[PDB]
Amino acid sequence: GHMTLYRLHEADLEIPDAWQDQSINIFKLPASGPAREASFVISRDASQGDAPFADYVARQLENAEKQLPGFKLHKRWDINIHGHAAVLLDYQWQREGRDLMLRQVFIERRPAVLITTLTTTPADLPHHEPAWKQAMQTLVPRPT
Amino acid sequence: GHMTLYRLHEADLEIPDAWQDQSINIFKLPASGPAREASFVISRDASQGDAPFADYVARQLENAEKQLPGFKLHKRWDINIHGHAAVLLDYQWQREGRDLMLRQVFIERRPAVLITTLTTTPADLPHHEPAWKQAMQTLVPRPT
C-alpha cells in the first residue's frame, strides 16, 4: 500500500499512489470597469510520456488549432520558469458567436505538466493582464 | 500589493485576494473486481461567513433534503479533526435515476469550509471504505 503525502492549500493528507489525480485549481477574476469576469485555472497533464517537451507543446497547439472554431494564434513564447521549460500561447476562438481569448502557459514537470490558463476576451485581456502577470511571476514549481 | 501565497502540490504562487477560489481536488479510487471506480473530491465553501458552524452544517443538510431527489441520511457524526470542528454525513440520493452513496466531511476552516466527498454506490461502499477512512485519518488541516 504505497502512499504519498499530498499538499493542498488548506491541508495535507496521504494519498495512495494508485489513486488517479485529476485536481484542478480554479480562480474567478472579478469584473472591472468595462471588463467582465475571467478565470485562471491550473490543471495537470500526465500525457507527455517520453516525448520532448517541444513536441508535447506542438501537439497541444495543433489540437487547439484544429478543434476550436475561429482559432487564431496571437503569440507563442518560449520562456523559463525557475529552470522549468515553458511555453506561453495567446490564442482566441469563437464560442456561441462570442470571441474568447486564452493565455495559456505549459510548464514542464514530472509526473505531470502544469498548465495555467487565463480565459477572458480580446478586449478584456489588457484589463486582466496585470493581475495575471503578478500571479505568474510568483509561481515557483516545487521539486519532484 | 493585495495578495496571498497559495500552496498546491506542484507549486506555490501569489494569488490576488480579490480572486474567488473554486478549486477542486479530484482522486479516482480504482475499480477492483465487481466494485466500480469511486471518487474522492476536496472542495471549498466560503459561504459560512460569521455564522456558527453548526448552523452552516444544518443549512447544508436542508439544502440536500430540498434539492437532491431521493435524499436519505444514514448517519451524522460530529467529530474533531486536529482541533477543527467537523461533521461527517453518510447519505444517499438518486442521481439521474440511480442511487449513490456519499460520505461527506465538512471541516470548519477560514476563510472557507474544507469539504471532502467520497462518492460510490451502496454496493461498492464497503469495498472503498478502508482506503477512504485511512486517507481521512491522515488529513491534517493547515493553520491559517
For residue A111, say if its preceding peptide bond is cis, omega within 30 degrees of 0.
Answer: yes
Phi, psi torsion values for A105, nearest 5 degrees: -115, 125
The correct CATH number of B1-144 out of 3.40.190.10, 1.10.10.10, 3.40.1000.10, 3.40.250.10 is 3.40.1000.10
Inter-chain residue contact A26 with B23, CB threshold 8 Å: yes
Specify burial of residue A41 (Cβ count, 10 A radius: 0-12, 13-18, 19+): middle
Is A55 within 8 Å of A126 (Cβ atoms)?
Answer: no
Q: How far is CA A7 from the centre of its chain?
A: 19
Closest CA relative to residue A101, chosen from A114, A117, A77, A115: A117
Residue B29 and residue A20: Cα distance in Å, rounded? 7
Residue A24 and residue A39: Cα distance in Å, rounded? 12
Q: In this structure, what is the dihedral angle of CA atoms B28, B29, B31, B35, given to the nearest 10 degrees?
A: -120
Residue A121 and residue B29: Cα distance in Å, rounded? 37
Inter-chain residue contact B9 with A6, CB threshold 8 Å: yes
Is A7 within 8 Å of B8 (Cβ atoms)?
Answer: yes
The residues, any chain, with a CB within 8 Å of residue A21's CB and separated by 6 or more, are A6, A15, A44, A112, B25, B26, B27
Residue B70 and residue B93: Cα distance in Å, rounded? 5
B102: its cell numbers: 456519499
| DSSP codes joined into one string, A111-126 | SSEEEEEEEE-TTTHH
Closest CA relative to residue B87, chosen from B100, B75, B78, B99: B78
Technique used:
X-ray
The B-side interface with A (CB below 8 A) comprises 1, 3, 6-16, 18-30, 40, 42, 44, 107, 109, 112, 114, 131, 134-136, 138-142
Inter-chain residue contact A13 with B44, CB threshold 8 Å: no
Alpha helices in chain B (DSSP H): 53-67, 125-137
Count Cβ atoms below 10 Å from residue A139 Cβ, excluding itself.
22
Chain A: nearest CA to B43, how far in angstroms?
10
Closest CA relative to residue B44, chosen from B71, B20, B22, B19: B22
Q: CA dist B78 to A30, A90, B143, Å?
A: 36, 49, 21
Is A124 within 8 Å of A102 (Cβ atoms)?
Answer: no
B57: its cell numbers: 452544517
Q: Which of B10, B27, B107 is the closest to A142 by Cβ?
A: B10
| Residue B55, helix vs strand vs coil | helix
Phi, psi torsion values for A100, nearest 5 degrees: -110, 140
Residue A108 and residue B54: Cα distance in Å, rounded? 44
Is B18 within 8 Å of A40 (Cβ atoms)?
Answer: no
Burial B92-106 (b: 16+ CB within 10 A, else e): bbeeeeeebbbbbbb
Phi, psi torsion values for A51, nearest 5 degrees: -70, 140
Phi, psi torsion values for A107, nearest 5 degrees: -120, 115
